Subunit: 156 residues, 3 copies
Amino acid sequence: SYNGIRIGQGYDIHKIKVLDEEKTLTLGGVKINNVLVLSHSDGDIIYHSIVDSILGALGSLDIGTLFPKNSAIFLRYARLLIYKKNYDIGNVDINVIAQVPKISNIRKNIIKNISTVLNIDESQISVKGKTHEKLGVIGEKKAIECFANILLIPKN
Amino acid sequence: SYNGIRIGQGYDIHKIKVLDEEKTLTLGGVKINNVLVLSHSDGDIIYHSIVDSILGALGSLDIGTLFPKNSAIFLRYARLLIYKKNYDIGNVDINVIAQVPKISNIRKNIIKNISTVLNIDESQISVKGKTHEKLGVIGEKKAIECFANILLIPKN
Amino acid sequence: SYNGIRIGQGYDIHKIKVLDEEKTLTLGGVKINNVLVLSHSDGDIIYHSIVDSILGALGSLDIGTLFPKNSAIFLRYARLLIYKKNYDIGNVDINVIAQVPKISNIRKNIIKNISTVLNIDESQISVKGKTHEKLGVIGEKKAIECFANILLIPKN
Ligand SMILES: [Zn+2]
Ligand SMILES: [Zn+2]
Ligand SMILES: [Zn+2]
Ligand SMILES: [Zn+2]
Ligand SMILES: [Zn+2]
Ligand SMILES: [Zn+2]
């Protein structure tokens, strides 16, 4: 059983519809009032990819597989899983690849939200937004995706 | 010469054709009998991205460049390269981004296959599958891609 | 304030135009004379994603947000930021996902360029090129993208 330092990378992608001129997206727990997310879940690519990076770091079955609204249940889950396995989080670096919304505007709020739900300091979190040159599925605003990269550090 | 902890990220993408109604894919050493992979190589995005994450972690020339069927030759290669450089693998986290096949169904078999070819425990491996909302090249089943993230830990 | 080992992942994407038969791209500080990059910046996905992986590792505001030609100003910035925070770089692994140009041909020059601008050894750098099966925005040569993965190691 390996108990050294662990890497995780979560990935998520959700279909969206921008309320331009011809269910509301939540991103890092922040409501995005001009974008709908077309999903059975709440569409929070940031929360879901963070859960997936934790699960991945530790080698668990993923969320859908484990449990066959929901985003907070899973994040609390992931936090308590790191605890029971005797790890702390080192830092997490999140890349949201999204033509809309702009992330810089809501970045402080996402970071505080993550830090509360993971119970870690704001200095252990980075959330960055990248547009996609208005090319492809993302750049045409049909979808948004997120990569979350995390290190877990063995306690003591 | 740096001998501390090392990060690697491998990436791979292969063209596929799903045998719907109008050479066989291998994924993590598992044959996928309803999908053809259109490739000169065996199309194993999982094996190839794992090799590339190891090579990347250590700063080698990549597979094609190094050696200008094949997937086992390269994986044995990568395992023995980690050995000769005096590293062990920490853990590896693999994200297959594929509309088909579903990964959860074959996940145990891929993990055992990786653990045998890398000679590491099953607890050091995570393999996760993500669909792509039926959007773009991946979501339309024209291709499958994989990201493999690894840490190498200096021996002793 | 967390001062253990840190992970960063930078991502960047730029629009390009290949000078086929019907401003010049710089990649890892190397000029690519058959490709134009359609950008307000110099289009160096490799330099920019490296800066973003450093900023991400450390939890800074990103480049555009921090400072609202340019690629060297930012890289020197990132190097001196790692210094002032009391970190060294472990290693960096870069995946350029580009149908053109081929990276293997210019890989030595990019690695020497990175190692000079970051002031680290060539053994701490890996730069890998992956084509995209001539599918999608990348495979059709409309864009090139890069992922840069880095570990920062607390001094002493
Ligand atoms: Zn999701
Ligand atoms: Zn995508
Ligand atoms: Zn391959
Ligand atoms: Zn792709
Ligand atoms: Zn850029
Ligand atoms: Zn892309």
